[model samples]
Target: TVIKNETGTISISQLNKNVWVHTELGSFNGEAVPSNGLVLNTSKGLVLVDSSWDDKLTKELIEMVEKKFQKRVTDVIITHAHADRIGGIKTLKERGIKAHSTALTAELAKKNGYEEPLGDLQTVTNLKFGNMKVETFYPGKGHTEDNIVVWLPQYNILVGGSLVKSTSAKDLGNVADAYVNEWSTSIENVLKRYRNINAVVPGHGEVGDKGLLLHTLDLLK
Candidate 1:
């Protein structure tokens, strides 16, 4: 199914047993930039991947989740510190939602001139939501100095944010503040650590299979 909002468009699909991919409609910036987030159904509640870019849209997204799952969002993962990726954090905060991100993301959020942290002020170590085990790791920098990827070990899925982008004929997009010199290696590290990744949920475009990681590597090469 698909949901369209001011921030972007979202296509929801069941990718695996308990994993659902929400692919955002490409941004209006003309890059056809696909942004995405994920939902992992567990016994407890829902785990939101990345919040959409706009406050109103994200609220609506949260509403949809609540209506469909019949449960509140128990946790949130901020993939990176980008505005489009984490801009709607305030909406989550207003609802008393707990959001987690890498220290680098928090630090960079302040350094990059953002008013505050992208998400709520809650900090966590390891989270167990529903039937999913979410491990947040910041092995190194890639798309930005604060990029942190989330790994769903139970499902063998990696939310690679902008580190691994869709390989369609879309533009590579600019990496002005990006660690261009080290971005490729950062992505390589993810592939190396999660060799069994079945699906790679990118920050933009579409939900790609493991092949998308290799395709992104090839793009940088």
Candidate 2:
């Protein structure tokens, strides 16, 4: 039930009554890659889990969601400092949407030469938008030092960012800034903190269940 835009580079689909998943295609490592993020349709407004690859795609995504939901995007929670996650800070700022991220993420984004988001999130922060509760947790370092995961307790869904891999992932995607030795420990922290997760969204692949966490651990083995 995914809906694609005219160019077919970006698409979004509803995951439940108020949650949707948005994906955008961008070139990475010399090939076209698809990135995944969550779109929470809260009464207050729309809360985006992450932005698209850049401004153009991110703007298109915002337009699509706002048109479909008939509500403006209010906020964005960045999971990491990677381009696929924070590259659209300008677009968000231009539209007056607040971009929230951890201090570490902000610093990394600056170091990586991207626009930085507000460093407002703590180690564990819970935000309520209208009736939707969005919890963000820093599960230590796996994908990147600043990577974080978002939890929708009401929906039992976890956006694992790049810390947890999809079942189809053969190996770690990018490790230039990864903490490989601590990756497994980070995954364990997530497993210990959350349970009964009905859906798990990877940073760049198909959604799955808790097995995605275990699969990530297995990959680290």
Candidate 3:
């Protein structure tokens, strides 16, 4: 059931000028789940790292961003196809928002019964939005085969989606569909490539510094 808290409360925090984080509380696995999403400022408008939680939270997020910036979320870049990651794609498509992901994400998502951004559309490797340089690389297979990371070079921020865990995490949360064996190499590729990240945002829990990546690698190892 949708309680007042479920639909009413969304924790929003501004980490910096280039980045903001939002968490929506919802039900998952018979308990409440808080999923994180990122709202980034661009030269023209806003870009979303993940819409987050579910459709209702997604709609509310868009409205909140529009209200705050007086601009719409220009694009949505998802890291994977998990419900917490791409649940908002339906609302985004309904609102005519352009969604992008890696080709592997699109393909693997379907097999996992995850929604495609534009109905089995093509996913690009990388692109630019407004003044922001956005890049998506497959690194390797981790949480899911199609999972990817979004790198903001200017801000040195990496949105790990479910590919990485928070510093506060005791263990890798959900691995029902994860590739535990290959997880290490996948993140190693990310660590090797994006060397100067200042902030690391996981799919859930608190955001942290470079140690989150190391911690995640530790979990996998």
Candidate 4:
């Protein structure tokens, strides 16, 4: 694992060759929290998993990716419609980056006054970047009706977005819009499909391992 803090941000940390998690400090439910997103280095340069809390932080995340990899983010995967997840959609879209999301999420985003996304990945979509294969899987509904998880099969890594929680999380963050009943089964679908996910990245908090999936299920149940 090579680490570089040259960007000097509390918002960005590269955990391995495949993923770089970025964060920004923001208040959530009254307490300040770190909003997270991922910058994955692929054969085509970079792909963003989520955006920041706002336009400014989102720009910073994109800038860091460009400065680090010398390429702009060509695609962005929106795990949901929350501000923490897709707040930067307008900015990214204005810049011509394809903002990708589920059809349900696109509808929600439109209702929320955000621009429509490609919505090409309604249930799931697989893309190959260089030698890495990244797939977006929508287990069902939990955190949001359209929440999806990114799967890096070649490496057995699951970037579970808010669909999965960190091992250290005590409770679900913002479930005001979650499908509380469907949460567990949705995750079960993930477990049923992929057997090996050694690296697990929650939509927030620290990254962990396979246990993160069970931790998420426990909270949902």
What's model 1's overall lDDT? 0.71
lDDT (10s digit) by residue, model 3, range 161-181: 788899877788778878999
**What do the candidate models score in CA lDDT, each in turn?**
0.71, 0.92, 0.78, 0.81
lDDT of 3 at 100: 79
Clashes of each: 5, 0, 0, 3
lDDT of prediction 3: 0.78
Highest lDDT: give the candidate number: 2
TM-score of each: 0.86, 0.98, 0.89, 0.92
Tens digit of lDDT per residue, candidate 4, span 1-221?
43334353336677777687777776556576765677888877788888877777677778767887887788888889888888888789888888888888888989998888878785778877776688989889888888999888777878888888887689997888998999989988999888877788888778888788899888876
TM-score of 3: 0.89
Q: Which candidate leads in TM-score? A: 2
Q: In model 2, what is the error at residue 123, expressed in angstroms?
A: 0.7
Instruction: Give lDDT tens digits, candidate 2, residues 1-221.
Output: 68999898998877899998898999767477889999999999999999989999999999999999999999999999999999899999888999999999999999988888998999999999999999999989989999999999998999998898888799997899899899999888888889689999999889999999999988887
TM-score of 2: 0.98
**Candidates arranged by lDDT, highest first:** 2, 4, 3, 1
Give the worst 10-residue stretch by lDDT in candidate 3. Answer: 1-10
- Residue 99 local lDDT, model 2: 97
